[PDB]
């Protein structure tokens, strides 16, 4: 896997379209090593290819596969407010669930 | 090492540049036959390369203004047809053709 970070911020729909444009997908860490690699390429908070849009509190990658490895920041995922169904990687490498309509950097994954 | 990725949609060079730059990459510029073939492997149809002769006609440079050495022009190219062809695309046989920078093609991005 190769990871590339965007320079501009955007909602998940646009982030997905960006990674897809170059035939990749939004980065999904499967272990601590991939998590670190993604953190290092990201200079700020960035979207990961994980959501619980289909079923609340059931986090899966953009292809419907349930994720095994997680690295939630203490207190997350909390689905605050009207709902948080997307996931971002904070600058310390931990994850936070956020609204899919908010804007963050994106890290794309390629094989 | 360099990694090459191809776009799905067609777009003019300026847009191709913005796409590759969005992920901190550049438009692919083969420096030898091996890279040219690697770009061929990922490009399913005619695609833009990061080469132009916009500064001086018939003096091809990469997008950073650096004069290229290796070229793989298709027989009869570059011919700068009509109002001018100052951008470059990799044909489906790996050879190159100069085309208008305003025409749309797939883009192959390069990362290191
Ligand atoms: O305090 C943590 C809390 O901060 C904000 O409200 C958002 O980033 C939430 O997603 C997060 O859970
Ligand atoms: O005959 C080859 C010629 O075909 C078209 O006119 C264009 O693709 C030109 O760039 C190319 O040189
Ligand atoms: Ca949720
Ligand atoms: Ca949250
Ligand atoms: Ca020309
Ligand atoms: Ca030509
Ligand atoms: Cl949401």
Describe this structure in words.
The structure is a homodimer. The first copy, chain A, has 111 residues and is of the alpha+beta class. Chain A has one domain: Mannose-Binding Protein A, subunit A (Mannose-Binding Protein A, Chain A), CATH 3.10.100. Chain A contains 2 helices and 7 strands. In chain A, strands 1, 2, 3, 4, 5, 6 and 7 form a 7-stranded mixed β-sheet that branches. In chain A, β3 and β4 form a beta hairpin. Chain A is globular, with a radius of gyration of 12 Å. The termini of chain A are close together. Chains A and B meet through β1 and α1 of A and β1 and α1 of B. Bound molecules: alpha-D-mannopyranose (2 copies), calcium ion (4 copies) and chloride ion (CL). The site of chloride ion has 6 residues of chain A, from loops. Chain A: Oligomeric complex of 3 or more homotrimers. Interacts with MASP1 and MASP2. Interacts with MEP1A and MEP1B and may inhibit their catalytic activity. Chain A: This is Mannose-binding protein C. Chain A: It is found in: Secreted.
């Amino acid at each position: 896997k190769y990871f590339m970070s965007s320079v501009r911020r955007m909602p998940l729909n646009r982030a997905k379209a960006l990674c897809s444009e170059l035939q990749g997908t939004v980065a999904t860490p499967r272990n601590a090593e991939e998590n670190r690699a993604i953190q290092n390429v990201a200079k700020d908070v960035a979207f990961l290819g994980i959501t619980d849009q289909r079923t609340e509190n059931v986090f899966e990658d953009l292809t419907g596969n349930r994720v095994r490895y997680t690295n939630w920041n203490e207190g997350e995922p909390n689905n605050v407010g009207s709902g948080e169904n997307c996931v971002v990687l904070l600058t310390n490498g931990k994850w936070n669930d956020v609204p899919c309509s908010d804007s963050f950097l994106v890290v794309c994954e390629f094989s």
